[PDB]
Every structure is written in structure tokens, then in C-alpha cells.
């Protein structure tokens, strides 16, 4: 997933693109929540479905 | 001997090897390391940069 770009305008025409894995999507926003009575697979499933 | 082919699809355009691609990086991480890409293209007049 594209996340950043760089470009040198003066003479040298160079544009640098940067992309990251989808885990970057899971690390974007800080959350406050609570989980009770859920297995690791269930918690991961809910988080991925989000 | 190396006979590379590199094709990058971004947005709605493609960069092929020998057309504008200057350099390309990689990462395939497991734990602390994620997967990322950093690739540089020749952007005459910065059009793609725009």
C-alpha cells in the first residue's frame, strides 16, 4: 500500500515511491477497548474483520 | 546470469524495466520486520510526482 512519496525537481528528475504491508493499516490508530471470554483466534478474527 | 523483469502497477499506470525504473528495494519480514517497498523512477517534468 502506497504510503509516501519523494521528488527532486531541480534537474535530476527523480520520484521515489514507498509502500508498506497491510499491517501498517492495523497500526494507524490508537484504540481503547476491552475483550472478555475470547480466544486468540477469535480476537484476531474480529480485529481482521474490522 | 541475470535476466530480470520488473513490473510495478500503481494507481492506474505501470512502470516496466528499461522504461523509467531507476532503482527498486524490497523487504520480506517475519517478526519485528514488516514488508515494504521503496522504488525510484525517472519523472520527466515530475509528471508522475504531480
Amino acid at each position: 500500500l502506497h504510503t509516501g512519496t519523494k521528488h527532486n525537481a531541480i534537474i535530476s528528475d527523480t520520484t521515489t515511491f514507498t509502500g508498506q504491508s497491510v499491517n501498517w493499516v492495523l497500526n494507524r490508530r490508537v484504540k481503547n477497548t476491552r475483550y472478555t471470554g475470547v480466544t486468540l483466534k477469535g480476537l484476531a478474527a474480529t480485529i481482521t474483520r474490522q | 546470469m541475470q535476466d530480470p523483469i520488473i513490473k510495478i502497477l500503481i494507481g492506474n499506470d505501470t512502470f516496466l524495466l528499461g522504461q523509467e525504473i531507476i532503482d527498486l528495494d524490497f523487504q520480506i519480514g517475519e517478526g519485528k520486520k514488516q514488508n515494504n517497498i521503496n522504488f525510484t523512477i525517472f519523472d520527466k517534468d515530475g509528471f508522475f510526482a504531480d
Binding site: 504510503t3 508498506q20 | 519480514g29 519485528k32 514488516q34 521503496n38
Partner: peptide, 24 residues
């Protein structure tokens, strides 16, 4: 000398930005 000091600084910066995107 200063040219290369700057080059080295920029190398380090891009290696640190690399590390930012290298780690999850």
C-alpha cells in the same frame, strides 16, 4: 568534507527512514 558530511547525514536520515518502514 562538508559536502560529504552532509551526504553522510542524508544517508543516515534515509537509513533511519528506512528503519522506520523496515520495522512493524
Amino acid at each position: 568534507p562538508q559536502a560529504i558530511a552532509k551526504q553522510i547525514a542524508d544517508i543516515i536520515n534515509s537509513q533511519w527512514q528506512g528503519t522506520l518502514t523496515d520495522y512493524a
